[PDB]
């Protein structure tokens with residue numbers, strides 16, 4: 001009975017500080033079990049995430065470390081706030097788990113996808129979402145796992161991005177356990193194994209906004225490969241200038257696919273599905289559809305960027321330099337340490353981080 | 359156009 005008690009959260013066993021009370025699970029993901037909680041010292045509910053297996057491998061390790069570093073160095077009104085982080089193990093030798101405590105919002109975008117919105121709320125939610133992503137991109141940091149359950153909102157219409165384990169700098173798209181990223185939101189470049197730059201996130205934004213308008217997942221898709229069938233059936237078979245960029249092995253498969261003309265953005269997104277129109281020229285379904293048509297673009301070199309997305313008539317009515325141009329986050333260099341160390345050496349960096357972060 | 363301050367999530 002020291003400073004931590006434990007509890008049976010569903011299937012796992014959270015061993016946590018006494019200031020955290022009530023627990024109750026709320027999210028079981030590919031990178032951690034998260035619970036709601038009441039923090040007596042702070043007197044407001046909080047969210048606790050046990051990093052599920054931080055060391056069964058170099059891949060989980062660097063993902064854990066990155067979440068840690070990032071949750072500490074990247075602050076913005078649209079980025080989940082890091083409240084506390086600790087471990088109930090007493091020595092680097094005993095060291096085994098990591099607990100991340102952060103802000104608890106009211107709901108998921110999955111929840112927002114289940115309601116009718118008006119042009120102000122929809123336009124505004126996207127703007128906040130783009131301001132958060134823009135903050136990451138200003139540091140060259142790409143999210144890579146943007147989806148409806150990683151975007152959270154409060155009852156006062158505020159939004160924060162969350163989850164940075166998969167976050168990292170541009171380059172090759174070859175990731176381990178790609179099963180970690182939900183497929184309905186994988187960008188063409190992630191699917192076909194091409195390279196990826198910051199606007200790979202904008203394709204997710206597009207998938208998401210599309211789901212908000214339609215309420216049904218945009219590119220369903222029964223498996224990793226069928227995901228591609230779904231995109232081209234809706235968007236059209238890409239041009240030859242883009243096939244020429246594919247890896248020899250992949251390019252050949254892509255060229256043997258059936259040819260699709262794709263559908264127009266108004267068959268794809270008829271007005272009825274967009275918020276009711278008023279007499280305004282910005283917050284109009286056509287401006288919103290125009291923005292979609294600039295994100296749901298396969299060839300990523302013709303896709304819109306986060307800056308052009310904040311400039312767009314449909315989003316721009318809320319533009320405020322303080323949010324959209326906030327000075328960039330700065331990271332110590334620990335991330336610049338994108339080097340591969342051994343499971344042990346990882347245990348080392350992690351333990352440190354946790355200690356000097358508690 | 360003022361920023362919305364409420365969202366019925368219920």
Ligand SMILES: CCCCN(Cc1ccc(-c2ccccc2-c2nn[nH]n2)cc1)c1nc(C)cc(C)n1
Nearest residue numbers: 172173174178191192193194224225228247249250
């Ligand atoms: C529609 C297409 C589905 C195919 N597909 C994608 C894919 C893309 C690139 C390569 C590749 C090949 C040769 C040299 C390098 C790389 C490479 N990888 N990352 N960068 N370059 C291998 C597979 C795929 N991926 C996964 C993960 C599970 C399945 C079932 N299919």
